[PDB]
Amino acid sequence: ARQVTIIGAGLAGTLVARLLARNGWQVNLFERRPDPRIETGARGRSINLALAERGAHALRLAGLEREVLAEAVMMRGRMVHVPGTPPNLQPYGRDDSEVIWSINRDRLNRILLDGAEAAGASIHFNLGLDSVDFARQRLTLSNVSGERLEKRFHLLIGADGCNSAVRQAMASVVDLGEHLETQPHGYKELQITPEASAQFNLEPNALHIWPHGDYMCIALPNLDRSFTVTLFLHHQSPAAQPASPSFAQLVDGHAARRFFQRQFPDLSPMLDSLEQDFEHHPTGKLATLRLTTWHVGGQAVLLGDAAHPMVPFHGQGMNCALEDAVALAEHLQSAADNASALAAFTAQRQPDALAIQAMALENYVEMSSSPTYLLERELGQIMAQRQPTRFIPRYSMVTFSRLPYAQAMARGQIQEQLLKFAVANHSDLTSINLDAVEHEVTRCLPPL
Ligand SMILES: Cc1cc2nc3c(=O)[nH]c(=O)nc-3n(C[C@H](O)[C@H](O)[C@H](O)COP(=O)(O)OP(=O)(O)OC[C@H]3O[C@@H](n4cnc5c(N)ncnc54)[C@H](O)[C@@H]3O)c2cc1C
Ligand SMILES: [Cl-]
């Protein structure tokens, strides 16, 4: 039986552990944090995420989709809150087949942990990877106190998140060709109680957005009708605009309250613990990191956030990591040797990871901030009705299909240019020749 060591019992790490163990691999998984299934007196984490077709299909192959969706809230559409006008639901698709699921992160992690152990994997908690000696095939782990433990390894999988210790150890034996692009936005997690959401009639089966240009708020529902709110705001005010809002200008919780009362007046009354949450929850950091190399021969490989950190403006990070886990287990199972598998996995997944990283950065302007946009959207809806197998909106290709990310991006660019050109010198749809646009659709877009 083939042997494998995995670092990180997160979302990608636990899924890949189950897929390999059920195929007869001898699997050992190491996690820095304690086992979350061991109940303590401490408060549970209220963090949630948007699960789409890519992530759901990966769970379906693993035999875990039913268990996960049993505790997921259906999001049928987007609820945009702009002051003055009441919110109106913008449905994602034709029916409840085209939806996104809101799931508690800790609940998903516990289901995955149970799944990896049921398949035969051994999980070791309270052990963080410190360093790797590739030539001697040994690694060093330690608990929070710093007490060290050495282990021999054969194949190493880096599923240890955006600040990966496996990636740091690899950078010493190979040039990874790393390119980091910092993000000016920070984030803060806040809460809406079940009592407050019900009092203010906040729709439970939708994803909520409070757009405000350079900054914004999003809210995802929980099973108990509570909501997890995320504020996206610049860490620092720029030199060009010194008076602009930023985290630096929000010295305490009282400062945060006055800011919300002024910029988000319909959201502020729903945030009862705004002051406490602002001061106790730390500000998170965002970035895009691109690597030319994801592996070291047949010895080590990276996947998920360890391989491709991305901005969270498309809700596809977890979805991508689960898709990576399926591809890695498939390559390792059927290759001539581990070196061949790691090279082929890297070649297949790298162009897709670059495509989703670029699409996530582009999606920020869509969520946070036109007469020309509405005409393009109207013509795009008609083209999708005439040719539903050729004209599929980019958001729909990413979120509701398994088309490779690079293909979704390429087809999306063809459609965006087709719509832009068609409306360019026209006041309204009555002056636009619909059959001529349809001809461009059939000429430039093959059926799927
Ligand atoms: C604000 C925000 C919102 C998001 N919303 C969404 C969303 O709606 N939909 C979506 O698809 N994605 C979303 N994402 C992205 C998503 O959270 C991540 O992409 C995903 O968790 C990555 O999975 P992973 O397994 O690669 O890493 P992780 O889930 O981060 O797991 C890494 C694991 O490794 C462990 N670890 C770290 N270092 C070590 C070490 N040295 N030794 C041992 N163990 C270690 C960690 O404790 C952790 O358990 C969001 C991200 C952010 C920041
Ligand atoms: Cl994301």
Residue numbers in the entry: 7 to 375, 379 to 457
Wording from the paper:
Further rounds of improvement were successful in delivering a high resolution-diffracting monoclinic crystal form with two holoenzyme molecules in the asymmetric unit that was amenable to ligand soaking studies.
Kynurenine-3-monooxygenase (KMO) is a class A flavoprotein monooxygenase (FPMO) which catalyses the hydroxylation of L-kynurenine (L-Kyn) to 3-hydroxykynurenine (3-HK), using NADPH as a co-substrate. It lies at a key branch point of the kynurenine pathway and its expression is largely restricted to the liver, kidney, some monocytic cells, and to a lesser extent in the microglia within the brain. We therefore turned our attention to the homologous bacterial P. fluorescens enzyme, Pf-KMO, which shares 34% sequence identity with the human enzyme, but lacks the transmembrane region and had been previously extensively characterized by Crozier-Reabe et al.. The KMO monomer consists of three domains: the α+β FAD-binding domain, an α+β domain containing a six-stranded, mostly antiparallel, β-sheet and a C-terminal four-helix bundle domain.
